[PDB]
Amino acid sequence: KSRGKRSGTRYKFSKKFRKHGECTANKYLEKLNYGDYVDIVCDSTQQKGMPFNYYHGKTGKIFHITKRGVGVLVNKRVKHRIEQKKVCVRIEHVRKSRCNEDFLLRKIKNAELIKEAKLKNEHINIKRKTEGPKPAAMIKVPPSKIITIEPLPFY
Amino acid sequence: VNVPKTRKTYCSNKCKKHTMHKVSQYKKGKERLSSLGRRRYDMKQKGFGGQTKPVFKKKAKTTKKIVLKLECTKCKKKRFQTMKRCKTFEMGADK
Amino acid sequence: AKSKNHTNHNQNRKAHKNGIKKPKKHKFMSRKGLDPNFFRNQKYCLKGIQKKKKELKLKAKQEKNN
RNA sequence: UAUGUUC
RNA sequence: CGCGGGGUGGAGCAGCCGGUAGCUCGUCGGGCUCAUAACCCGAAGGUCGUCGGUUCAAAUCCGGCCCCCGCAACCA
RNA sequence: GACUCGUUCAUACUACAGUGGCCACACCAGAUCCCAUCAGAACUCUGAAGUUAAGCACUGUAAGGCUUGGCUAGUACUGAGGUGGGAGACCGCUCGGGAACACCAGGUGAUGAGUCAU
RNA sequence: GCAGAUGUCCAAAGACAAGCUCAAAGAGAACAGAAAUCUCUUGUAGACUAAAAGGGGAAAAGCUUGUUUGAUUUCUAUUUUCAGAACAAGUAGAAAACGUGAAAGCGUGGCCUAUCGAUCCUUUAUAUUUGCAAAAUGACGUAAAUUACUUACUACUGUGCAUAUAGAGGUGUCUGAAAAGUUACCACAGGGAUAACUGGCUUGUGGCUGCCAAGCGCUCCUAGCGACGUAGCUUUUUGAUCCUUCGAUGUCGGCUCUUCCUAUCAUUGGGACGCAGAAGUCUCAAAGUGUCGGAUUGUUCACCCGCUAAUAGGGAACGUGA
RNA sequence: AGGGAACGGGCUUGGCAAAAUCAGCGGGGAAAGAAGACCCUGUUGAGCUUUACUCUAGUCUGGCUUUGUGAAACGACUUAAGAGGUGCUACUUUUAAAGUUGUUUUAC
RNA sequence: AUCCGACUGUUUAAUUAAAACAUAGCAUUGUGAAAAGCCACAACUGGUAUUAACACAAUGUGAUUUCUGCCCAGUGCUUUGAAUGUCAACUUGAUGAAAUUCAAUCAAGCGCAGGUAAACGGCGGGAGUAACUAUGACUCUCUUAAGGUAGCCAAAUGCCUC
RNA sequence: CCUAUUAGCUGGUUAUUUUCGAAAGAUCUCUCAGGAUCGCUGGAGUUGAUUAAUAUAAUUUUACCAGGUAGAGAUAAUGAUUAGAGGACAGGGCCUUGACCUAUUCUCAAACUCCCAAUAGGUAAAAAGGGCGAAAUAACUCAAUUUGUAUUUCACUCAUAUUAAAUAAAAUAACUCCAAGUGGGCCAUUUUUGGUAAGCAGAACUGGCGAUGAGGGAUGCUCCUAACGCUUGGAUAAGGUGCCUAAAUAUUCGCUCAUGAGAUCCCAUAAAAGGUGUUGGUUCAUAUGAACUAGCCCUGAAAAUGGAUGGCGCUAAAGCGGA
RNA sequence: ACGGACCAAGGAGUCUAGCAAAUGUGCAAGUGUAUAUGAUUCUUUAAACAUUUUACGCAUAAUUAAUGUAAUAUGUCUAUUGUAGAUUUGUGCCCCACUUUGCAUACAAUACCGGUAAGCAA
RNA sequence: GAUGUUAGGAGGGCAAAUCCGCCGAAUUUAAGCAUAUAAUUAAGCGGAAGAAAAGAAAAUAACUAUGAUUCC
RNA sequence: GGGUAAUUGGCGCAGUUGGUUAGCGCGCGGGUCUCAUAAUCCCGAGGUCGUGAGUUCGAUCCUCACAUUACCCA
């Protein structure tokens, strides 16, 4: 019966304990470029440019940049299909996403590894390892700390 | 709701600046008998058959949207500016 | 009579029967309402590039066809 | 030719 | 029980249309009369059913309770 | 030693103390002028006689708070399985995840750019 | 389902800027008191922000002051509901013209979440846009020529009406008919998607049985009771539900007749007593036998008269209408 | 008996179960009749009622026509002069009975 | 003996024979006539009417006896009006180039002012009060158009109520 | 006769095999027995793939996000809430009553929160791309005609011989067109609202029934195993092996005697309270006395046709708990 | 729960109009010879056959209420631009990476036409 | 004008498919319903022929103009 | 929405350029004892705003304010 814009956002759109007040001045200094990933985190202190309830905590690419706003493409699930939605928010409610920071670091590191590997014509495995079973270890331990365990009685 | 008689506002016709505007309230005006709809309705109502068109008899709301007629003093052209609906409306009442 | 008001039962398997379709993700997007005074300038940039390329190609074609 | 109780 | 109205001086009723609570009978005091009534003069008495809320301001407006009253409680 | 612009936004706050000053901040002397009020209190303007009393800086307190770690505790809770137990309420087991309050201990900052003084 | 709120209100309660800091408490000051004004200290908001509630807010979003009308015209990309239609309400912008500020900036109504309306018709505004079906209407207007049906060139052309665009007049059943009853004289299509009766689940209610022991019982918790509490059973009441029957399961009571249950009224045999006898009360095994005549009422129920040994309680589609 | 659409002739588990017949009987076949008449639904009706919506016969009233022939009175219009305020000029009252019209009464 | 209907009579052919209908009696209403009342008809014309207020038509009540109270506020019905508001067609006037647009007035009705209940109908509530108790002749007060009178009653009308 | 009027309603709706195969949600609706529309489905067709790879995925991993439910708390705030302890405004007679303050204390919240899981959710993991440069273009941006931005052209090269993490009968893909039926649902586990409760009413997730048979649960639309062409063998699942009834009167170790024993999830009821029945344990007292504890058994335990661990029956179990 | 005592025979998505999609066929910027005509055709034949060198429908151009206006634009018989992309060309008659071309289509960008805004407007 | 068993004649009724006048619904559709639709239809009354009726412009057009009616 | 009329003392009320006027209400005195009867001042945005006019509540106009008819395609 009640489906207003901010219905059900009592806790989601509330500032954290001892974290009230407007955004820092350094937030206005962050750089945004077209096509880079961004997190939509609603900041309740700024009322204009406020994203809808659903998009809080989502991630999307920039498709539009304005003087104080940004347009971001977010996938939203609608029953039988995902569909793209263009949400326009002020820059207070958006934050540079770290979803691909590991990817960028891996890109630069693998580049400078492959450079020297090809220089020394050594064939190197560059893909991530998903490390599983550990090898056998021939481990030493003095008998001063091999303590015996018994299940405890009831009290 | 109180609005003043005059207003310095943008003029959208015949003079593209901000000018002084006289503000009044728009009134509906009588439906003339020579209007095509009225002539058609009267011709339809003639003869036997009784009432030939619906007559609304529900009357839910109690107010009307307020329409301001803005008349630019420099270029004598009028404009319409609709306001939110209100129960009491005065033009140029005391502050 | 009294009717069942609402249920989301079977809706998820209905959705997954044809799978959760993803957006097509085309390479280019229309710039209709995006950044005027920037995309207009981009139109000017493209026109300049095309004019230079076309005049150079026309010069080559004329000098090679005599 | 107003009215005007009781002990 | 569903409502849809009301609780104000000792009694019956206004103000109860937010700011200054009225009238009659009642009560008191003094006159008139041998005395009592009637009559004349002058006073007093309202905590506004109860608890919260709004308002600069509540007996008044808004709710919640306690009583009173009036309708409804039908088809098998 | 200090100042300006910042960052982090309490390890940075709060209370009560102690120490410190040459240019340094500041308190401070005035109201003609710009300006300002009821009030030169503030704001603004013009100064340099005085002072570290205060602001400021540093430190201290079996300080409060904050913060980090431990411990609470594999406890509470919980995903999956069960022709598991139990009359039920509830409670185990198997494959997994895993708190919080409280309490204890340590700490009370770090830093970017620029500049002044020696 | 629960606690509420809306059909409003605001030339400021909109816009911008500046300055200031609020509620409250403590202490102090003629009148002056629990409250009237002033001063100081503390004061993370305990105030205020139109309203419901929830978010937000301290050199502010609050208070005061100053200047204002951005509550303006036009157009996009879009979010909410969602069919990813509309309205509506928003978000980010662009083109004008402005306000404010010293400026950076901010402002396309209200700090945010609600406060609203299609087609057709009407109405009034805008237009160097159009029409009214063979034509003209400003105007023979401006330049030449003769006694004419002369020739060139003019954004600006009669009343009335219709159109295009934009607001408004409303549909609150709010994606939007112009709409009072009654049928016990009734009809039809259907419905067990749905009531009235059995049955079914449940057992609040009704009925029956336990546990504890404060007390009653002259003293003595438990001979007999047992408050405050608490555990069950039954389907003999009434509810709750709507599972089966609406191309029909004959809906009260009585009469008649049979059978069954036991939670036993009497009869048989026992145990306990607050048990001298008599009478009675509590209780066990036990359903073999029996549980009546009448006045009033359609009654069930009830209530009297009377006998009796006793006049117990129930079931069988509320047993039983071919 | 169970479960089952929660009251089975059929199903499951049991009890059981031995040809053909005659006469009664009303427990059951949730027996027969018969697309429930009660109730609800239908944007299906009908009868009836009203200060439901929209109409309508009748009825009341006015106008025009039928509708002719005379008279009088009143009113109004037109036309000349006086008077009031009044900027060659504009409005108001009265005076005539001059030409025109309407009404009310009356006569044939 | 009680209830109902006065009686004779009539009725739901095939579930109701009655207390229902009728009835005499009583009361009210309209109408003096072919330009009347009531009614029929599409029109023409007709029924009452071969009639004429001791008549016809329209109602209510229901023999006799004894009575038939108050209310015209409401709704009906009805009566008077150049003082009177409102209104249609028409008419007249003004303006316009005309369509048009504006004004003005002796209809009926409504409104205004009356009448009418054997028209539809309606016809109150709190307190206090008499040498025991009880009740309230009496008093105060609110209030209506009038406040249910004469009568009658747990009535075929009273829930509570056996 | 108009008229075979209309009916969102009831009934019926005619050969075979084969293949694919639903919905009982949602939005609007004078809508609630209907309809349109979306979703689910079939048929047709193209583009693709056919290159153990890419697209792709009801999956995980790695990296990074967002949350305020369970829990916890009441001394952190708000709202409740029981008690005292200590200590400088009011009342009466040095005292008391309180108020107030301080530090405690018992207990709580769907519309409380300092903190905060599990599960669930989102994004990214390279070739139409990335990195690094030079040159061009622009009316954009900047103090910058050479600041930056974007685009374009040239260069160089970033694993691919296992594939920029794993796994993948991943192209059985993607897209387009036309169209059917459906739009009364119900049940089970877990969560949950109203209700005393209900085989009650209303929701969430997944799986089912419906639409579906087969083996088992005696019986049973929804439980367990398991889903189905026609066969021959084998071996099993669930569940059973005393007979009915295929398979153990198997083996091995305990418990239990019931004058209403007990005997497979759903499932076909049982409680508070008791027992000097018996079997083990625990803690106290010089093989004795107690108090507890929990297994089976017993009381509590009453209903109507005659009756049901499914029946017979079973006690050196054919019962209960194991192996 | 309703219908069905039995058997035979009859017994229900059809016909027309109009639209679209799908597929087959013919022709193709055209397609369909409408009504009608002629012809030693006249059982069949009510069908077949035929049509002296702008009939009409649909298509070939859209947009606007509308007066109306109407698709690169004469540098050029080049035929707009990108990114993917089928096919083709060569070099390392049959595997693969560079070259060459660039269908259909998808995603965009550009122009141009009609309408509306805005600016100018003899 | 009347009146005439004066002379000579006509009309009447049946039949309807097509045809000409009049009169005139509702079912139905609108998912209700009242305008609208059904329909200038059905039913009803009357009147003709092998055809009837219409027909030689008080017609179109707006053109370089056509030329009674009917029908495709 | 159209036409008409009305609201000036506390009550009621009519009045319009050289204008605010009154009966009742208020207050006392007075009256032949107490009711009934004369007297004075107190009582007015002439409903509201604007407008015309040496000289207006006044003349015109609009706003709401009440009572009658009559009107309804938003």
Swiss-Prot record, chain B:
Its main location: cytoplasm. Component of the large ribosomal subunit. Mature ribosomes consist of a small (40S) and a large (60S) subunit. The 40S subunit contains about 32 different proteins and 1 molecule of RNA (18S). The 60S subunit contains about 42 different proteins and 3 molecules of RNA (28S, 5.8S and 5S). One of its GO terms (biological process) is translation. It is found in: Cytoplasm. InterPro entries: Ribosomal_eL44, Ribosomal_LSU_eL42, Ribosomal_zn-bd. GO terms for molecular function: structural constituent of ribosome. It comes from the Eukaryota. This is Large ribosomal subunit protein eL42. The lineage of its organism: Eukaryota, Sar, Alveolata, Apicomplexa, Aconoidasida. Keywords: Cytoplasm, Ribonucleoprotein, Ribosomal protein.
